[PDB]
Amino acid sequence: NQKLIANQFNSAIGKIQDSLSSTASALGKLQDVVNQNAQALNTLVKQLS
Amino acid sequence: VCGPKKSTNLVKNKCVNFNFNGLTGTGVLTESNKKFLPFQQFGRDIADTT
Numbered sequence A: 001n002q003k004l005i006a007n008q009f010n011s012a013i014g015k016i017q018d019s020l021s022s023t024a025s026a027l028g029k030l031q032d033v034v035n036q037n038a039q040a041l042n043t044l045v046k047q048l049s
Numbered sequence B: 001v002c003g004p005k006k007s008t009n010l011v012k013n014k015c016v017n018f019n020f021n022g023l024t025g026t027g028v029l030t031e032s033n034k035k036f037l038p039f040q041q042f043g044r045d046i047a048d049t050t
């Protein structure tokens, strides 16, 4: 089934691109880290006031 | 209503110790395009600094 398997693989990769390029939430785990750090710094700066 | 203080010239694009109407700090004074309203003398940052 090598040809079938290669075709399914190639298709699956194309699906990954379609998901990643259109679903912003797909990378929420990394964006959340950035957001937490940004909040920590914004909080720290605002405290100066 | 300001005290008996003699003003000096303003020097731009260099680190200076400034005093504007009693407001002091250290920094570089540069030209800007900030649209202050006729009644606004000072602008502020997130930290409430000038």
Ligand SMILES: *[C@@H]1O[C@H](CO)[C@@H](O[C@@H]2O[C@H](CO)[C@@H](O)[C@H](O)[C@H]2NC(C)=O)[C@H](O)[C@H]1NC(C)=O
Binding pocket: A004, A007, A008
């Ligand atoms: C196993 O499933 C795959 C699909 O996941 C079958 O391959 C498809 O077969 C149809 C015809 O019935 C074609 O129109 C598709 O283009 C084929 N897909 C791919 C990726 O080649 C495969 O025939 C099935 N095998 C068995 C034994 O049932």
